[PDB]
Design a protein around this nucleic acid. Structure first.
Ligand SMILES: [Mg+2]
Lengths: 225, 428, 558, 211
DNA sequence: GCTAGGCGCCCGAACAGGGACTGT
DNA sequence: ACAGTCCCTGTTCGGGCGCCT
């Protein structure tokens, strides 16, 4: 019955501060053994401990970031806070908040966790992606299976939805995770389908970018010659 | 100069004078703390400087409570407490709640400061004198005495009871399911509430006291490794009774049978239903110890029968609040200690086993003092009185270190005994 | 002058009156001398004429110094003292130069006319009344009473020390960086101030004491290394005990033994190893006072060995706070132990020796434990800190002992220094009955009304022996029977008693005792190879115990 | 500052196997270590606390052990869910520290990378850019390298990459490499060679195009 | 017709308490 | 079923010497 949900800004300007909210239920931040811990996890890396705020206000901070951290709490409404000052691109990560608790004389672990809020650090402005089809060029198709692609370049921010044929094709589909292209994001998706269906039957690439309210389709037309 | 409430007259036992006990050496760390806490009480006028004209004395030392880090002054008023045992015990004593033993959790608060607010009988003050020593006898000892109810004196809680019963009226009315007992500088508060909900209610009680002038030590709760503060509350139900048990075997040598009858003979004083004639028969002539004697059918009929009596309540053993309490400890090795509490020879009231502690870290002296405290605590809770101790150690040894591990507001009455392994009457 | 220090109140023991002791007629020669003295003390405010109303008197006779020829007023307060209340004496122990810290500038001061400078409780002076009989039996001698602390009175020391503590009290609150070792009327002052700012602080002190009436004569230790303090000599970095003159007489009376031993003990505080156990057993007895006693070779070797190590000029060093303490114990003669407390390799702070045998039947592990304890206390008193030990006992030896001993024991952090003779247990004891050995059944008995009794064993092998004894008791005979089964057996045995008295003395694994019977039983235990004792409840008719009972119980019955 | 390290970084195994994860401490932590499970999605759950105590709800096929400096997690018989990333956390001293994580995979028969390359779309070229995409789909195990070669000579400058997680269906991995140049930098050449080296074939799998 | 108070050591006497045995 | 003694061992204390002020 213990639940925890992080609240955040998701996208934060560099050098500005951010404030995460851990809204919980099921326990009180006033009971003897409870405390609320904040964990970070850079995209790709492992778990990093930030700080733990306890019922008796005897808080403990990560020595590397104590200068930019401040953990608060609203015991009344069951909320825990985490402020970070002068954030850098290095603070782009998923932040989790979990209910830490001291059970006995040796038992002390983070019993329950949250799903985490993603906070990314960038000046980049919400700009839509430019979609480019990928069809075997200079190499005509044989008689087996052909692999068509789709390139989603220069967008911000995450995420983007990629499907094929309005969601019809889903078997040999591979959508790769994006990467940073000068503050912008760039990803590609590939689809493999028997040569007996392309280009005899149309294959279109579906790209959705919620931030910019843009939805564009691009048909994978075969090579010029 | 402190409280306009009328002073209550206290007179020592007829034909007995005041305490004239000498002051034992004190370590610099304790003198330093003791000199400080004494200076402050002098300013506030709880304590007055005195000289040679006062023929009485008592010992003092300080203990650095791992409870709250902060030091505490302790005055060994055991002598004085005997000299005035008419005043607090028979005259005006604090009733005992049979229900405190019956609580899943009980916390204990140090309500000593509460006493520094009632004027002590102007005449009786001479007896509370004490001396502070100095490293390398640099200066004559600095002496003081009390002007207000002193901590660690059996009379203080007795006198302060009037106002104490009034400070508790509200809390006890809004929480009739909580038991509260006062024993000297301690308040034993026990509840059947959940642990975390108990911690709260205690914390609330501290407030209610604070709203009345009574301050109670601020106990620390560390957030690292050994979460010792989880032990702060006692659990009277979790307390067990270690019974006497006869070994179990198939191949009983001559030796084994001897010891098995020895123990059974000892135990015959506790349980009159122990017979050994049928079992001793196996040993008749001058046989060699190392000789597996077959256990007879009607012979092993008592071995498995007597043990069926060694798990029962002793013979109509009841506690008498009018007789003292005695307690014995026997070093059972590998860090284990057993104990027995009784008022009469073999009719004991409790028999238990004080299992080890990792904070003791192989130190016989440290474990014995902890055992003494642990046992005293249980005593106060269950019956409401400290037992006299028959300590399995040498005087010289105990008096050199017991203070280094003492962590209680009170000091029990003890004597030293050199009784060798009488018998493993208490098979651990 | 005199002091403006509030007077300390003194009473007489509950239900007693003052001293009304008659005065002896003194000689016109002695009388006239006292008159000058008293007119002087009266002139200086120390004493005062009392009225005819004062019914108290204590004996006062004059006595001359066999060197200066000066006569001195000597008042004998033996009776007053027997009636003066009890004081809780404030002096708690003498100070030791070993606890002194190295200070830049050191000065020592002495108070002149100390006692005669502190006022006596006005409601008590009447008891210090004394009279100076006149030359002729004509008119009553001059009557006087005391106004200052009477020389040789019970409260004079306790009252002066407290007074003195109050005087320094404020001064020490304003100079927390200057140590004042207050002892009777002698003051040691030391600090890390510059010779100039120091002497400017010392004068500041002398003028503060003069304010309270305490005079500090110019016969004080000003920049005078070594300083003569407490019977020692304080040098910049080293201190020496003042020349101890070992008494070397022709014949030796019991009294001369007491005069030698005490001076030896006094020296043992700084002199490496000093044994006394031996020549101390000379007065051993009821023979008192002046009675020549024959100095055995036992004592001769003691005196010779000591005079040698006492002829070795040694010293001590001061205490350094940062560097902890180390106490090293050495095992010497029967019950004689020697220790050296230091903080740096062979830089002794203080030495000493303990030889108290606690218990009738003890052993070397016990006594070592006893030495460690009394050393700790002694250190706590001089340094307020528990020292680290370097004991000559194997880590394994100790583990065995405390782990098997039923009594609780312990020893603070200690290292093992391998310097013989090492301390260890001389004989073990089987936890389990050994297989392939006679399992003896020993017992004894005796008659209180008579004096003698038998004692013996009955083994499983049918063997029996009963040796009768005279002037013995149950405890001795039941202890005798265990001695037999020891002599009458191999290297492996299984004795079996019915008395804890005997069993207990044994399990304790003693290696020394008071009575011989036990010294013999110990000698056997150390000689054998596998002993095992077992206990059985006597008079309960059990196994091989009945055999020895009836057999030895020729005095008792059933 | 207690450094917690899990030497074993990425570990593959099969359903039913027995796996043990090692967590080494930088100093004695007196058995004050907890174990965490983080599913591929991301949710984090507490398995074991205090070296070897199961948190209510975690299956019995989970068990911890270790002491002093060395600690180990043992999953008796792998189940589909188990295959995940595992973390050890120490709390005998703040700051609290976590291991390095040990990804638990699914063992599969080896497979080579199906390599496809793509000429910069026309639309991309119309803007003024040019990206040459090169997919390396479905292979085993993960370890793989890529090298770009323009008109013979190789170019390591301008190459982006993207690796995928072990597919939860066929247990394979995939990678996407993209060489981005300019409209000029691109047209000013002819042969663009995508080369991929996997453990399956000694010969690097190569795919190229011209003009 | 010469101190007091304090600490130390060594010694033996008186005490005190726990056990064990003898007599109604 | 002890009451009345006797043993034995551990502690306390009074005495004398040492040393100090
Ligand atoms: Mg017998």
């Amino acid at each position: 019955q213990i639940t925890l949900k992080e609240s955040g800004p998701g996208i934060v300007q560099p050098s500005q501060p951010f404030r995460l909210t851990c809204t919980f239920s099921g326990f009180s931040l006033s009971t003897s053994g409870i405390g609320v811990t904040w964990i970070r996890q850079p995209s790709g890396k492992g778990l990093e401990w930030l700080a733990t705020i306890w019922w008796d206000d005897d808080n403990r901070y990560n020595p590397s970031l104590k200068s930019r951290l401040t953990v608060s709490k609203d015991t009344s409404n069951n909320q825990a806070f985490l402020n970070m000052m002068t954030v850098e691109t290095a603070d782009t990560a998923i932040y989790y908040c979990a209910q830490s608790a001291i059970t006995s004389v040796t038992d002390s672990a983070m019993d329950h966790w949250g799903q985490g809020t993603s906070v990314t650090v960038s000046s980049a402005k919400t700009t839509p992606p430019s979609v480019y089809p990928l069809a075997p060029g200079s190499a005509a198709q044989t008689n087996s299976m052909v692999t068509l692609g789709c390139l989603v370049k220069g967008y911000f921010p995450e995420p983007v939805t990629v499907t094929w044929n309005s969601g019809s094709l889903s078997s040999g589909v591979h959508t790769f995770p994006a990467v940073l292209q000068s503050d912008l994001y760039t990803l590609s998706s590939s689809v493999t389908v028997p040569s007996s269906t392309w280009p005899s039957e149309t294959v279109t690439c579906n790209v959705a970018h919620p931030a910019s309210s843009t939805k564009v389709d691009k048909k994978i037309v075969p090579a010029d010659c | 100069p402190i409280s306009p409430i009328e002073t209550v007259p206290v007179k020592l036992k007829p034909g007995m004078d005041g305490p004239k006990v000498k002051q034992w050496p004190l370590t610099e760390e304790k003198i330093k703390a003791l000199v400080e806490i004494c200076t402050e009480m002098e300013k506030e006028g709880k304590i007055s400087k005195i000289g040679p004209e006062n023929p009485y004395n008592t010992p003092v030392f300080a203990i650095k409570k791992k409870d709250s880090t902060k030091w505490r002054k302790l005055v060994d008023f055991r002598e004085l407490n005997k000299r005035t045992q008419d005043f607090w015990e028979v005259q005006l004593g604090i009733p005992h709640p049979a229900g405190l033993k019956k609580k899943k959790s009980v916390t204990v608060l140090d309500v000593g400061d509460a006493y520094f607010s009632v004027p002590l009988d102007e005449d009786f003050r001479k007896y509370t004198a004490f001396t502070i020593p100095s490293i390398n006898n640099e200066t004559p000892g600095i002496r003081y005495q009390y002007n207000v109810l002193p901590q660690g004196w059996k009379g203080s809680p007795a006198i302060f009871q009037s106002s104490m019963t009034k400070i508790l009226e509200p809390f006890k009315k809004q929480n009739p399911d909580i038991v509260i007992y006062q024993y000297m500088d301690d308040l034993y508060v026990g509840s059947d509430l959940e642990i975390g909900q108990h911690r709260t209610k205690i914390e609330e009680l501290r407030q209610h006291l604070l709203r009345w002038g009574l301050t109670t030590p601020d106990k620390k709760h560390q957030k690292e490794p050994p979460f010792l503060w989880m032990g702060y509350e006692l659990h009277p139900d979790k307390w067990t009774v270690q019974p006497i048990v006869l070994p179990e075997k198939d191949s009983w040598t001559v030796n084994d049978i001897q010891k098995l009858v020895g123990k059974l003979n000892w135990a015959s004083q506790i349980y009159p239903g122990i017979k050994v004639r049928q079992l001793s028969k196996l040993l008749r002539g001058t046989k060699a110890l190392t000789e597996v004697i077959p256990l007879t059918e009607e012979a092993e009929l008592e071995l498995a029968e007597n043990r069926e009596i060694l798990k029962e309540p002793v013979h109509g053993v009841y506690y008498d609040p009018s007789k003292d309490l005695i307690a014995e400890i026997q070093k059972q090795g590998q860090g284990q200690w057993t104990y027995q509490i009784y008022q009469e020879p073999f009719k004991n009231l409790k028999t238990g086993k004080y299992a080890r502690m990792r904070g003791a870290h192989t130190n016989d002296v440290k474990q014995l003092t902890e055992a003494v405290q642990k046992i005293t605590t249980e005593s106060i809770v269950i019956w409401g009185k400290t037992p006299k101790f028959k300590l399995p150690i040498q005087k010289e040894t105990w008096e050199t270190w017991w203070t280094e591990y003492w962590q209680a507001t009170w000091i029990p009455e003890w004597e030293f005994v050199n009784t060798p392994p009488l018998v493993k009457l208490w098979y651990q | 002058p005199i002091s403006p220090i509030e007077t300390v109140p003194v009473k007489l023991k509950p239900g007693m009156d003052g001293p009304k002791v008659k005065q002896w007629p003194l000689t016109e020669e002695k009388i006239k001398a006292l008159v000058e003295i008293c007119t002087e003390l009266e002139k200086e405010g120390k004493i005062s004429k009392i009225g005819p109303e004062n019914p108290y008197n204590t004996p006062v006779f004059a006595i001359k110094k066999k060197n200066s020829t000066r006569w001195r007023k000597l008042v004998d307060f033996r009776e007053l003292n027997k009636r003066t209340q009890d004081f809780w004496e404030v002096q708690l122990g003498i100070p030791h130069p070993a606890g002194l810290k190295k200070k830049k500038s050191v000065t020592v001061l002495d108070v002149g006319d100390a006692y005669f400078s502190v006022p006596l409780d006005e409601d008590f002076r009447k008891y210090t009344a004394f009279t100076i009989p006149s030359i002729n039996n004509e008119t009553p001698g001059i009557r006087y009473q005391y106004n200052v602390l009477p020389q040789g009175w019970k409260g004079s020391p306790a009252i002066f020390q407290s007074s003195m503590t109050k005087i320094l009290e404020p001064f020490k609150k304003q100079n927390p960086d200057i140590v004042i070792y207050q002892y009777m009327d002698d003051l040691y002052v030391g600090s890390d101030l510059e010779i100039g700012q120091h002497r400017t602080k010392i004068e500041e002190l002398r003028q503060h004491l003069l304010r309270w009436g305490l005079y500090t004569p110019d016969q004080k230790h000003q920049k005078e290394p070594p300083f003569l303090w407490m019977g020692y000599e304080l040098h910049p970095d080293k201190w020496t005990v003042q020349p101890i003159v070992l008494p070397e007489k022709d014949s030796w009376t019991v009294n001369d033994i007491c005069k030698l031993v005490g001076k030896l003990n006094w020296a043992s505080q700084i002199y490496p190893g000093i044994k006394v156990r031996q020549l101390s057993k000379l007065l051993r007895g009821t023979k008192a006072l002046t009675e020549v006693i024959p100095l055995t070779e036992e004592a001769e070797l003691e005196l010779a060995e000591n005079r040698e190590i006492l002829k070795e000029p040694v010293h001590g060093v001061y205490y350094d706070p940062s560097k902890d303490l180390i106490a090293e114990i050495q095992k010497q003669g029967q019950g004689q132990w020697t220790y050296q407390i230091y903080q740096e390799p062979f830089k002794n702070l203080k030495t000493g020796k303990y030889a108290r045998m606690r218990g009738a039947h003890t052993n070397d592990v016990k006594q070592l434990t006893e030495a460690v304890q009394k050393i700790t206390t002694e250190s706590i008193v001089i340094w307020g800190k528990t020292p680290k030990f370097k004991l000559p006992i194997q880590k394994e030896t100790w583990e065995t002992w405390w782990t098997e001993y039923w009594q609780a024991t312990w020893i603070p952090e200690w290292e093992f220094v391998n310097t013989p003779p090492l301390v260890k247990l001389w004989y073990q004891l089987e936890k389990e009955p050994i297989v392939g050995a006679e399992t003896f059944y020993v017992d004894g008995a005796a008659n209180r009304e008579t004096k003698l009794g038998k004692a013996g064993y009955v083994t499983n092998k049918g063997r029996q022996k009963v040796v009768p004894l005279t002037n013995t008791t149950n405890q001795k005979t039941e202890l005798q029977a265990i001695y037999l089964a020891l002599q009458d057996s191999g290297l492996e045995v299984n004795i079996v008693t019915d008395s804890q008295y005997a069993l207990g003395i044994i399990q304790a694994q003693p290696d020394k005792s008071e009575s011989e019977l036990v010294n013999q039983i110990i000698e056997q235990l150390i000689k054998k190879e596998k002993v095992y004792l077992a206990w059985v409840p006597a008079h309960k008719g059990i196994g091989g115990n009945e055999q020895v009972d009836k057999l030895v119980s020729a005095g008792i019955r059933k | 500052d207690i450094q917690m390290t899990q030497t074993t970084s990425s570990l593959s195994a099969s359903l039913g196997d027995r796996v043990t994860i090692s967590c080494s401490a930088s100093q004695d932590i007196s058995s004050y270590l907890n174990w965490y499970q983080q599913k591929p999605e991301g949710t984090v759950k507490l398995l074991i606390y205090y070296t070897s105590s199961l948190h209510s709800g975690v299956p019995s096929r989970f068990s911890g052990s270790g002491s002093g400096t060395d600690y180990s997690l043992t999953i008796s018989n792998l189940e589909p869910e188990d295959i995940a990333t595992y973390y050890c956390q120490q709390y005998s001293k703040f700051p609290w520290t976590f291991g390095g994580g040990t990804k638990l995979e699914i063992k599969r028969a080896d497979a080579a990378p199906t390599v496809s390359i793509f000429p910069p779309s026309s639309e991309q070229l119309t803007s003024g850019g040019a990206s040459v995409v090169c997919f390396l789909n479905n292979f085993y195990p993960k370890d793989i390298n890529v090298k770009w070669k323009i008109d013979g000579s190789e170019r390591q400058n301008g190459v982006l990459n993207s690796w995928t997680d072990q597919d939860s269906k066929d247990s394979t991995y995939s990678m996407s490499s993209t060489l981005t140049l300019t409209k000029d930098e691109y047209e000013r050449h002819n042969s663009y060679t995508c080369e991929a080296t996997h453990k399956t074939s000694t010969s690097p799998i190569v795919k190229s195009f011209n003009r």
